[PDB]
């Protein structure tokens, strides 16, 4: 259980605003669409029986909720999700982990031309060249820390992190909004 901490996941960012009266238009829309409970369960975007079949199990437009209706407010195609500013180059990812598990993280970045006003699909992600991978990182202080590389990009983008357990078919999913502008 967990979610991306740096760059902060969309679910954790809405939680940090105060789920009962969010600050941003985007998080207010997420709560009107899917309720406040999702934000308290920020560490629980999961598929119990994924077994590496992410693209088979998760429809386009359902990546940020992992096709769980509880999290459907996170699927909105907003141009205005609050975003972490990033730059191309080496990057130290921090994944906020509330329950450690053996397994592998892969982090994918949207392709050039990404339009956040359209639903997120697998086709929008560069799945052939993950920006980071980490197998069995060591939890410390409530985080996994692992490095990768953000490639050259120009404007609004999204990072999609898949955490597949190795002792279990369960996986966890995180989308983080970023901008290179
Ligand atoms: Cu867990
Ligand atoms: Na975005």
Numbering used by the authors: 1 to 181
Article passage:
Bacterial lytic polysaccharide monooxygenases (LPMOs) are known to oxidize the most abundant and recalcitrant polymers in Nature, namely cellulose and chitin. The genome of the model actinomycete Streptomyces coelicolor A3(2) encodes seven putative LPMOs, of which, upon phylogenetic analysis, four group with typical chitin-oxidizing LPMOs, two with typical cellulose-active LPMOs, and one which stands out by being part of a subclade of non-characterized enzymes. The latter enzyme, called ScLPMO10D, and most of the enzymes found in this subclade are unique, not only because of variation in the catalytic domain, but also as their C-terminus contains a cell wall sorting signal (CWSS), which flags the LPMO for covalent anchoring to the cell wall. While showing several structural and functional features typical for bacterial cellulose active LPMOs, ScLPMO10D is only active on chitin.
The structure of the catalytic domain of ScLPMO10D (residues 34–214, lacking the linker and the CWSS), hereafter called ScLPMO10DCD, was determined to 1.37 Å resolution with a single molecule in the asymmetric unit using the crystal structure of LPMO10A from Tectaria macrodonta (Tma12; PDB ID: 6IF738) as the starting model. The structure shows the typical LPMO fold with a central β-sandwich built up by two distorted β-sheets that are connected by several loops and helices. The active site of ScLPMO10D is formed by His34 and His134, which coordinate the bound copper cofactor in a T-shaped geometry. No water molecules were found adjacent to the copper, which indicates that the copper had been photo-reduced during data collection. The residues in the secondary coordination sphere resemble those found in C1-oxidizing cellulose-active AA10 LPMOs, such as ScLPMO10C26 and in the atypical chitin-active CjLPMO10A44. In ScLPMO10D, an additional arginine (Arg79) is interacting with Glu203 that together with Arg198 forms a remarkable arrangement that has, to the best of our knowledge, not been observed in any other LPMO. Generally, it is worth noting the considerable variation in second sphere residues, the functional implications of which are largely unknown. It is also worth noting that the arrangement of a catalytically crucial glutamate (Glu203) interacting closely with two positively charged residues (Arg79 and Arg198) really stands out from the active site arrangements found in other LPMOs. Like CjLPMO10A44, ScLPMO10D shows a “hybrid”-type catalytic center with features known from both cellulose-active and chitin-active LPMO10s. While Arg198 and Glu203 in ScLPMO10D are common to cellulose-active LPMO10s, Asn76 and Thr131 are common to chitin-active LPMOs.
